[PDB]
Amino acid sequence: QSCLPNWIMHGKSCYLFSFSGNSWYGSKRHCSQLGAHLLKIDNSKEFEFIESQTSSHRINAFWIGLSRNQSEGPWFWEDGSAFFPNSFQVRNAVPQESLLHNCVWIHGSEVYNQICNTSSYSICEKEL
Amino acid sequence: QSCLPNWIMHGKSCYLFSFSGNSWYGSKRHCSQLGAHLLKIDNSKEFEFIESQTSSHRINAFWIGLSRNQSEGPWFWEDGSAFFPNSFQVRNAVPQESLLHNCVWIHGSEVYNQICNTSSYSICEKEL
Ligand SMILES: OC[C@H]1O[C@@H](O[C@@H]2[C@@H](O)[C@H](O[C@@H]3[C@@H](O)[C@H](O)O[C@H](CO)[C@H]3O)O[C@H](CO)[C@H]2O)[C@H](O)[C@@H](O)[C@@H]1O
Ligand SMILES: [Ca+2]
Ligand SMILES: [Ca+2]
Ligand SMILES: [Cl-]
Ligand SMILES: [Cl-]
Ligand SMILES: [Cl-]
Ligand SMILES: [Cl-]
């Protein structure tokens, strides 16, 4: 069971911390080109591991595999599974200030909705 | 290089034509559980192959891996790559009638946007 150079092993996956600017869509294409996808956070153990990385690189936010279609509809993971907030809840959530913010990134220790094509860093995940 | 039972080979890929009603999200999940994604159509040859399966099964529509994130914003594929209308264009297209329709499905020979939540068949794809 093995990961590429520069990918970290944790839990049951290999993660790539992409220190390189990009839209949510761009980030997505980029992970998918390495045969991965954007990060999916299943349990709190995974969350905590990721959170160590993001919070020790607070200069920047990292796109994750979470988004929605309806400019105010339900969040869903890259794999299409539904969002349940057992590790975190998505922030900036009041009606008005959520408008157009349909992609999710992590910045520091928080997970925010953000305008999908803001440029940022990202995290890919390949399962084992 | 090989496909699972019931998946059909064509061009570079294995396909599964899934006759089970499900939402776009649902369909997406199901593909992903078999270790695949929803259909991504990279050219006319792929389109035409798909198109004869969809037109010979006009009773239902088939979800595909194309969606957008904001009620009037750019279409993107499951993989993050942007939509170019090489083989077809998305239909019901005037700014007002396609609000809340941010997922795409194929019905007969036409590619429509729809309410992501609607129930339907779907097509999965795993590239060799
Ligand atoms: O979505 C969760 C699901 O992802 C599955 O992986 C696929 C990737 O295999 C795929 O990458 C494709 C390459 O394999 C192929 O060679 O090239 C095409 C086009 O460049 C790539 O799309 O990317 C999709 C979308 O990110 C992934 O879903 C995993 O196998 C599976 O374990 C996981 O559940
Ligand atoms: Ca995960
Ligand atoms: Ca394809
Ligand atoms: Cl993804
Ligand atoms: Cl998909
Ligand atoms: Cl057309
Ligand atoms: Cl048509």
Resolution (Å) of this entry: 2.8
CA dist list (Å): B110 to A5, A28, B58, B107: 44, 27, 10, 6
* Cβ neighbours around A16 below 10 Å, total: 20
Q: What would the 3-class secondary structure string for chain A be?
A: CCCCCCCEEECCEEEEEECCCCCHHHHHHHHHHCCCEECCCCCHHHHHHHHHHHHCCCCCEEEEEEECCCCCCCCEECCCCECCCCCCCCECCCCHHHCCCCEEEEECCEEEEECCCCCCEEEEEEEC
Contact B70 A71 (CB under 8 A): yes
Query: Whose alpha carbon is nearest atom 12 of ligand 1?
Result: A35
Instruction: Report how many Cβ contacts below 8 Å link chain A to chain B.
Output: 54
Q: What per-residue string of b and e applies to A25-50 under the rule 16 or more CB within 10 Å gives b?
A: bbbbbbbbeeebbbbbbbeeebbeeb
Query: Whose alpha carbon is nearest atom 15 of ligand 1?
Result: B127
Contact A127/B at CB under 8 A: no
Contact B25 A102 (CB under 8 A): no
* Cβ neighbours around A75 below 10 Å, total: 16
Q: Which domains does chain A possess? A: 1-128 (3.10.100.10)
Rounded Cα–Cα distance for residues A50 and A72 (Å): 27
Rounded Cα–Cα distance for residues B104 and B39 (Å): 11
Method for structure elucidation: X-ray
